[PDB]
Design a protein around this motif. Structure first.
Motif, mmCIF file in Angstrom:
data_model
loop_
_atom_site.group_PDB
_atom_site.id
_atom_site.type_symbol
_atom_site.label_atom_id
_atom_site.label_comp_id
_atom_site.label_asym_id
_atom_site.label_seq_id
_atom_site.Cartn_x
_atom_site.Cartn_y
_atom_site.Cartn_z
ATOM 1 N N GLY A 18 0.779 -1.222 0.000
ATOM 2 C CA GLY A 18 0.000 0.000 0.000
ATOM 3 C C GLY A 18 0.814 1.277 0.000
ATOM 4 O O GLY A 18 0.397 2.279 0.590
ATOM 5 N N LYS A 19 1.974 1.261 -0.659
ATOM 6 C CA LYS A 19 2.791 2.467 -0.743
ATOM 7 C C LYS A 19 2.071 3.558 -1.529
ATOM 8 O O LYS A 19 1.772 4.631 -0.994
ATOM 9 C CB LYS A 19 4.148 2.148 -1.376
ATOM 10 C CG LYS A 19 5.084 1.350 -0.486
ATOM 11 C CD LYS A 19 6.379 0.993 -1.207
ATOM 12 C CE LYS A 19 6.144 -0.031 -2.306
ATOM 13 N NZ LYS A 19 7.416 -0.574 -2.860
ATOM 14 N N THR A 20 1.771 3.291 -2.804
ATOM 15 C CA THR A 20 1.157 4.308 -3.653
ATOM 16 C C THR A 20 -0.252 4.664 -3.195
ATOM 17 O O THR A 20 -0.697 5.799 -3.399
ATOM 18 C CB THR A 20 1.133 3.841 -5.108
ATOM 19 O OG1 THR A 20 0.494 2.560 -5.192
ATOM 20 C CG2 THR A 20 2.548 3.741 -5.658
ATOM 21 N N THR A 21 -0.969 3.719 -2.586
ATOM 22 C CA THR A 21 -2.302 4.027 -2.079
ATOM 23 C C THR A 21 -2.238 5.070 -0.970
ATOM 24 O O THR A 21 -3.040 6.012 -0.945
ATOM 25 C CB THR A 21 -2.984 2.754 -1.577
ATOM 26 O OG1 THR A 21 -2.977 1.762 -2.612
ATOM 27 C CG2 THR A 21 -4.420 3.045 -1.167
ATOM 28 N N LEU A 22 -1.282 4.919 -0.048
ATOM 29 C CA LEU A 22 -1.137 5.873 1.048
ATOM 30 C C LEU A 22 -0.758 7.253 0.531
ATOM 31 O O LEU A 22 -1.299 8.266 0.990
ATOM 32 C CB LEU A 22 -0.094 5.368 2.045
ATOM 33 C CG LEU A 22 0.311 6.319 3.174
ATOM 34 C CD1 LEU A 22 -0.896 6.725 3.999
ATOM 35 C CD2 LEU A 22 1.370 5.676 4.052
ATOM 36 N N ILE A 133 -5.879 -2.449 7.834
ATOM 37 C CA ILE A 133 -6.620 -2.927 9.001
ATOM 38 C C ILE A 133 -8.106 -3.073 8.728
ATOM 39 O O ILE A 133 -8.853 -3.480 9.627
ATOM 40 C CB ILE A 133 -6.444 -2.001 10.222
ATOM 41 C CG1 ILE A 133 -6.905 -0.580 9.887
ATOM 42 C CG2 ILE A 133 -4.999 -2.022 10.705
ATOM 43 C CD1 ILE A 133 -6.985 0.334 11.090
ATOM 44 N N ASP A 134 -8.562 -2.744 7.518
ATOM 45 C CA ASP A 134 -9.957 -2.973 7.167
ATOM 46 C C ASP A 134 -10.213 -4.425 6.785
ATOM 47 O O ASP A 134 -11.321 -4.930 7.000
ATOM 48 C CB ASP A 134 -10.374 -2.041 6.029
ATOM 49 C CG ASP A 134 -9.347 -1.983 4.918
ATOM 50 O OD1 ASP A 134 -8.171 -1.673 5.210
ATOM 51 O OD2 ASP A 134 -9.716 -2.255 3.756
ATOM 52 N N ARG A 135 -9.212 -5.114 6.230
ATOM 53 C CA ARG A 135 -9.352 -6.540 5.958
ATOM 54 C C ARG A 135 -9.381 -7.379 7.228
ATOM 55 O O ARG A 135 -9.562 -8.599 7.137
ATOM 56 C CB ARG A 135 -8.226 -7.026 5.044
ATOM 57 C CG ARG A 135 -8.414 -6.665 3.579
ATOM 58 C CD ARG A 135 -7.345 -7.313 2.709
ATOM 59 N NE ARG A 135 -7.208 -6.635 1.423
ATOM 60 C CZ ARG A 135 -6.209 -6.839 0.570
ATOM 61 N NH1 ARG A 135 -5.250 -7.708 0.864
ATOM 62 N NH2 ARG A 135 -6.164 -6.170 -0.577
HETATM 63 N N1 LIG Z 1 -8.501 -3.406 1.903
HETATM 64 C C1 LIG Z 1 -7.475 -2.539 1.727
HETATM 65 N N2 LIG Z 1 -6.780 -2.593 0.564
HETATM 66 C C2 LIG Z 1 -5.747 -1.751 0.336
HETATM 67 C C3 LIG Z 1 -5.387 -0.771 1.370
HETATM 68 N N3 LIG Z 1 -4.341 -0.076 0.885
HETATM 69 C C4 LIG Z 1 -4.056 -0.569 -0.350
HETATM 70 N N4 LIG Z 1 -4.901 -1.565 -0.675
HETATM 71 C C5 LIG Z 1 -4.914 -2.350 -1.935
HETATM 72 O O1 LIG Z 1 -3.632 -2.901 -2.239
HETATM 73 C C6 LIG Z 1 -3.489 -2.995 -3.659
HETATM 74 C C7 LIG Z 1 -2.072 -2.622 -4.059
HETATM 75 O O2 LIG Z 1 -1.590 -1.621 -3.168
HETATM 76 P P1 LIG Z 1 -0.496 -0.552 -3.665
HETATM 77 O O3 LIG Z 1 -0.742 0.779 -2.998
HETATM 78 O O4 LIG Z 1 -0.500 -0.416 -5.170
HETATM 79 O O5 LIG Z 1 0.867 -1.215 -3.130
HETATM 80 P P2 LIG Z 1 2.306 -0.536 -3.353
HETATM 81 O O6 LIG Z 1 3.034 -1.215 -4.487
HETATM 82 O O7 LIG Z 1 3.085 -0.718 -2.076
HETATM 83 O O8 LIG Z 1 2.151 0.935 -3.657
HETATM 84 C C8 LIG Z 1 -4.493 -2.034 -4.277
HETATM 85 O O9 LIG Z 1 -5.371 -2.750 -5.150
HETATM 86 C C9 LIG Z 1 -5.278 -1.461 -3.115
HETATM 87 O O10 LIG Z 1 -6.683 -1.509 -3.383
HETATM 88 C C10 LIG Z 1 -6.193 -0.773 2.614
HETATM 89 O O11 LIG Z 1 -5.953 0.028 3.544
HETATM 90 N N5 LIG Z 1 -7.189 -1.663 2.710
#
Ligand SMILES: Nc1nc2c(ncn2[C@@H]2O[C@H](COP(=O)(O)OP(=O)(O)O)[C@@H](O)[C@H]2O)c(=O)[nH]1
Length: 597
Positions: A18-22, A133-135
């Motif tokens: 969740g790097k890019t998501t955050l 933490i929602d999962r």
């Molecule tokens: N359920 C849930 N899914 C998440 C969360 N954060 C990220 N994801 C999921 O994780 C997947 C990949 O995360 P991403 O941010 O791309 O990982 P990164 O490569 O570290 O940046 C995405 O499809 C998001 O939907 C969260 O807090 N809760």
């Protein structure tokens, strides 16, 4: 003029955690609390003013128990390990503080181990975000709700799963010398590691995470964020671009001083310092002023403090990403900046003759990372250099292959292998390893070591001759061909028999070579004691030198005997020794070596 700049924050963590998501969630909390203002747009980064951080937190600002005189936070748009190895003119990471993102359900992963060691080698303070933490089964989700508010909506079953997974987190962190804890349980933030359970997908606990980032960066970097606006500019290259209309430009984060479109800069290459004069500086226009996505950039005169800017200037073709950019107003300043950059190259790049591997990476920071990750596992290195895998690397790994085949390899990190070198790597059997992460490129090399060592054992067993005793049947009924080749029914007395093996009599005379082993309509590759098979013996003629009923012995060499008894001892069964001793009593009549059996 400005008093103190903003800290440069990077985001680390394992892939898909969740790097890019955050990072995306923090840009969203910008707009919700933007409040009628244009926020300073950066090339490759996003600024979060403290006015957003304070109002997002609300009364939770009091958790830090100290006012925050920072103007904001500068988050890098590109996350991950590879972005973190971008190092300043003073060998340090351009990130003033990092955010380690760890999936709370997946736990510690290789890139988590990878980043923690880097965070300690650079002495970089960081915060840990327990994400996803929602999962957690049965979690009550509320969008953009601070963690301390959201946890009060949870039942004992869910809180238990959070407390349990934190326990495994803190155990892994303690296993690396870090006292970890939930953030509202940490007492001393300089002697302990704070963990913030967040949801980057829904914005849960983002308020508490930003408060800790803003607070920690201030109490850790009070003095060196207080840069004078006036000093010459020092920066780090984030990306090298051959822009269509702008030519060769470098995307850069300025971490100290003011950069001007008139400035003369010293740019770090892969083997030299680039002295050039800036032609133009570019930054994104105010967000509302964009009408064409193809034209988002303004020409700027100056950027200062922490800023992401595009530098157009001649000679940037040989510029290397992750290397520093140093402004030099005088020839002495030019001469000193050329020293620091080349001193940085001499410290990382190595060229030797020692029997070792060859390491190639994209940037200096990653080259030093993989070159020391190999030193952790005590793998010698013949050369480490920044660049694509050339033809003359393959030739050097060829000379290492001739000495020790274990180290005649090449390890390229985020590097494309040359066209003229890939054919040389297959024509000389030089193993090339291409990867994007450090831990897997070492594992793939070490997996190759296990393959090659076990092949070495396989080839040795196939090249040695094993001992075996046979006896010809006495009837003329088991004689199937009397010459060219002789095919006779035999019984193997002891040991084992195999084709291509030569046979001798009781007086030690070669009778012929075994063409093939045959039982019923099938053909066999070997026959062990108790098997009655028909064998073909080249050069032998029945009645001429071999006779029905006669006992024949597998001809062995001193090399074969020594190898079995001293290197392949665990492969010899009781029948194999008896065969070997029976042959030695035949071979002792002429060679007294076999008197040692
Ligand atoms: N359920 C849930 N899914 C998440 C969360 N954060 C990220 N994801 C999921 O994780 C997947 C990949 O995360 P991403 O941010 O791309 O990982 P990164 O490569 O570290 O940046 C995405 O499809 C998001 O939907 C969260 O807090 N809760």
């Amino acid at each position: 003029t400005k008093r103190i700049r903003q800290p440069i924050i990077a985001v680390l963590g394992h892939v898909d955690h969740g790097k890019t998501t955050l990072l995306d969630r923090i840009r969203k909390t910008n707009v919700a609390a933007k409040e009628a203002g244009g926020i300073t747009q950066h090339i490759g980064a996003t600024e979060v003013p403290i006015e957003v951080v304070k109002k997002i937190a609300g009364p939770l600002i009091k958790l830090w128990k100290a006012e925050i005189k920072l103007p904001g936070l500068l988050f890098i748009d590109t996350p991950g390990h590879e972005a973190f190895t971008s190092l300043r003119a003073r060998g340090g990471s351009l990130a003033d503080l990092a955010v380690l993102v760890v999936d709370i359900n997946e736990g510690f992963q290789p890139q988590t181990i990878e980043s923690i060691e880097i965070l300690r080698k650079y002495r970089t303070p960081f915060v840990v975000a327990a994400n996803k933490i929602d999962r957690i089964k049965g979690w009550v989700i509320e969008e953009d709700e601070p963690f301390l508010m959201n946890i009060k909506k949870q039942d004992q079953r869910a809180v238990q799963e959070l407390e349990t997974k934190l326990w495994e987190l803190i155990g892994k962190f303690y296993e690396f010398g870090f006292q970890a804890n939930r953030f509202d349980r940490v007492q001393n933030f300089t002697r302990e590691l704070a963990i913030v359970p967040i949801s980057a997908k829904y914005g849960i606990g983002i308020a508490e995470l930003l408060v800790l980032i803003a607070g920690l960066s201030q109490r850790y970097l009070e003095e060196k964020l207080k840069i004078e606006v006036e000093g010459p500019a020092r920066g780090t290259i984030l990306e090298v671009r051959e822009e269509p209309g702008l030519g060769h430009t470098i995307d850069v984060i300025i971490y100290d001083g003011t950069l001007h479109k008139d400035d003369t800069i010293v740019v770090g290459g892969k083997d030299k310092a680039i002295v050039t004069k800036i032609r133009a500086l570019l930054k994104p226009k105010p967000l509302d002023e964009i009408r064409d996505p193809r034209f988002r950039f303004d020409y700027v005169d100056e950027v200062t403090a922490a800023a992401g800017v595009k530098i157009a200037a001649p000679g940037l073709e040989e510029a290397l990403a992750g290397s520093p950019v140093i402004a030099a107003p005088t020839p002495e300043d030019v001469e000193k900046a050329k020293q620091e950059i080349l001193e940085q190259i001499e410290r990382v790049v190595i060229s030797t003759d020692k029997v070792g591997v060859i390491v190639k990476a994209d940037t200096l920071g990653s080259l030093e990372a993989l070159s020391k990750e190999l030193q952790e596992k005590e793998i010698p290195i013949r050369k480490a250099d920044v660049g694509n895998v050339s033809k003359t690397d393959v030739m050097e790994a060829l000379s290492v292959k001739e000495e020790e085949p274990k180290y005649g390899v090449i390890l390229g990190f985020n590097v494309k292998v040359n066209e003229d070198a890939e054919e040389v790597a297959k024509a000389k059997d030089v193993k090339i390893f291409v990867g994007n992460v450090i831990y897997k490129l070492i594992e793939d090399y070490e997996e190759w070591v296990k393959e090659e060592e076990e092949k070495k054992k396989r080839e040795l067993l196939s090249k040695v001759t094993f001992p075996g005793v046979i006896r010809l049947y006495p009837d003329e009924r088991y004689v199937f061909r009397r010459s060219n080749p002789a095919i006779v029914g035999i019984e193997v007395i002891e040991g084992r028999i195999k084709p291509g093996v030569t046979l001798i009599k009781q007086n030690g005379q070669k009778v012929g070579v075994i063409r093939s082993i045959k039982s019923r309509d099938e053909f066999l590759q070997e026959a062990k004691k108790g098997q009655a098979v028909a064998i073909a013996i080249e050069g032998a003629i029945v009645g001429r030198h071999i006779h029905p009923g006669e006992t024949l012995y597998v001809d062995l060499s001193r090399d074969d005997a020594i190898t079995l008894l001293k290197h392949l001892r665990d492969t010899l069964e009781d029948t194999d020794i008896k065969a070997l001793k029976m042959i030695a009593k035949v071979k002792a009549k002429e060679d007294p070596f076999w008197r040692a059996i």
